[PDB]
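Please predict the structure of the following assembly.
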Amino acid sequence: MKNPQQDSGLLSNSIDFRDQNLIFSNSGGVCTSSKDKIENYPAKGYPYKRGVKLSFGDGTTELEVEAGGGDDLYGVCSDIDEFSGMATVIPITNNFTGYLTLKKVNPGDKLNFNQHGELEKVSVNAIALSKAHKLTEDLFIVLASVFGNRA
Amino acid sequence: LMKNPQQDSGLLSNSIDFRDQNLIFSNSGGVCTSSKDKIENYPAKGYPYKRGVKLSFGDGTTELEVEAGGGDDLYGVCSDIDEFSGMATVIPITNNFTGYLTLKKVNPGDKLNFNQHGELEKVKSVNAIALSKAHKLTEDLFIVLASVFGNRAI
Amino acid sequence: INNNLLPFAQAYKLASSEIIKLINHFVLTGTVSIQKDGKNQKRLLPNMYGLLN
Amino acid sequence: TTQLVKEYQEKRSKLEKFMKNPQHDASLLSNSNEFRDKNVEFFASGGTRTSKFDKLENHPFLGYPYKRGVKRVIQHYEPHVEAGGGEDLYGICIDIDEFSKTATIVPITNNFEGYLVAKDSTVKVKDKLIFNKDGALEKVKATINATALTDAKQISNEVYLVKVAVFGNKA
């Protein structure tokens, strides 16, 4: 869940302005252009902040996006609407720079998406712009810039 | 070395003609530009003007920069530089570009690839095709009209 | 005629007619599709039903 | 005379087969009141889903590259685009103005979703497709990543349209 469902017990202190963006609720990218192509797809599971792949059913229902990677990588999920079950996808043709889930890494390392849509060190897909940031016991994020697929 | 020549010209320019008046090093941007083009700006490390650029990482004290390069590290193509701020305009490799780029010191329709110095050379992993022949601006400076559209498959 | 381009008013009228046909089909059958076979249906939210389904 | 008229009709039909929206005069108004399966036609230009920030380039073309993969060909006149695939693929033609002989092309760097010409009717859903030398999509060494969303649908004796999403190149 992008937004922590459990309510907080205390009001936050809005005095500092540093290191206030390394959160899982942060949706989108650090740098966003007005000419970016954005699509919306039915969500299979929770692909938020993970690479997505197109999955076709038996034909009765339309195609959807599921967390994955490898040669089946189609795009990167940057946002999700839970009420409508909709996943926001930036196509792999379009380049993306933002915080993505990392497999539980130093700047300059070449990262590729695994079968679960998690970035892992090495075809390369992105370059790590920072180090792993731990949000939960198994949840790690990393700032990466995706520039398509190149061997 | 500089987009605008540092030495002031000694004479006025003649502007009665309209043919072959674009083969200059200050012709920034692209010959054919779309209104839906994605453009970024990065700190410059050197003079990557009209050259293939790659991401350069320091010791972490300062932000990353872009430097001339290619091969398996190519990130985009620089098309303009603001000298005062040291800013390099970058068009990502994910977006196709058509314009004049520095050529290594070639017939139309030949396959081109970026070298370690960010210069085009005759051929692997980058889709670049030269649309004209080499134009010599200086004894060591050569330009060529080429179209770069994504990366190829190895 | 060659490029199938229309004025805004006529284009809006035709598009609205098609959308109303789709809405009527949804209200009747409970599914949203543009194929005669009935495949490739749009995945819809729960608690959204028609008279037939 | 009458035989010449018949031959003219035959050649006119053959030429009109390879046309986006051939102009015909009919004696009756065809009825297609059913709103389903009304979009699988040869004159349906563009794509099923279109974004405002899509890049379109108009180029002179040789032959008829409509709904086909196009490659840049340099000859004196400006270079044109010819229907072809393989490793020389440059883009895909989505519309043609025959009066100006100008083809609108989506570059390979931009993803597309729409109906394209297929080599035959041996293409199923979830099938890897490759552009052949004629610019047609054939079932699978694929430099690009194209997956069929539907099955091949026949319109003419050789017209086979299939819904395909192309999202770049492989590695």
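The radius of gyration of chain D is 17 Å. Chain D touches chain B through 21 residues (CB under 8 Å).
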